[PDB]
Amino acid sequence: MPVNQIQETISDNCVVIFSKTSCSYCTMAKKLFHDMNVNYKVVELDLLEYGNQFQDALYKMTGERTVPRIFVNGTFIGGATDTHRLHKEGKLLPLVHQCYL
Numbered sequence: 001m002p003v004n005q006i007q008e009t010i011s012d013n014c015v016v017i018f019s020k021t022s023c024s025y026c027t028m029a030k031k032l033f034h035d036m037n038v039n040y041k042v043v044e045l046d047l048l049e050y051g052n053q054f055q056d057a058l059y060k061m062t063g064e065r066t067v068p069r070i071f072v073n074g075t076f077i078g079g080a081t082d083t084h085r086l087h088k089e090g091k092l093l094p095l096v097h098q099c100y101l
């Protein structure tokens with residue numbers, strides 16, 4: 001069940017980016033975490049056999065189906081635009097640090 005695997009992945013990784021391989025928003029979100037020296041897990045929905053079902057479950061969980069859907073410490077933070085805003089505000093690295101602490 002995709003909803004289970006989603007929950008498993010976000011619980012087992014500090015940062016998860018549900019992504020597609022040719023999405024410019026996703027590339028930007030990867031770039032942001034990379035530039036912060038934060039390790040992330042990428043799930044490429046376009047390469048998964050049931051990625052459509054994953055995208056459905058991400059809609060049900062988060063309220064929207066667009067990629068990227070980004071989780072930090074098991075908490076949905078937004079898409080690419082939200083993540084950049086949270087980073088600009090100094091809200092993102094504290095969430096990353098809760099993970100470890």
Ligand SMILES: N[C@@H](CCC(=O)N[C@@H](CS)C(=O)NCC(=O)O)C(=O)O
Pocket residue numbers: 020022023024025065066067068078079080081082
């Ligand atoms: N406002 C969103 C924009 C994301 C977005 O529009 N993503 C496109 C892919 S580039 C999308 O998900 N399109 C529909 C789809 O692939 O299902 C964000 O900042 O994350």
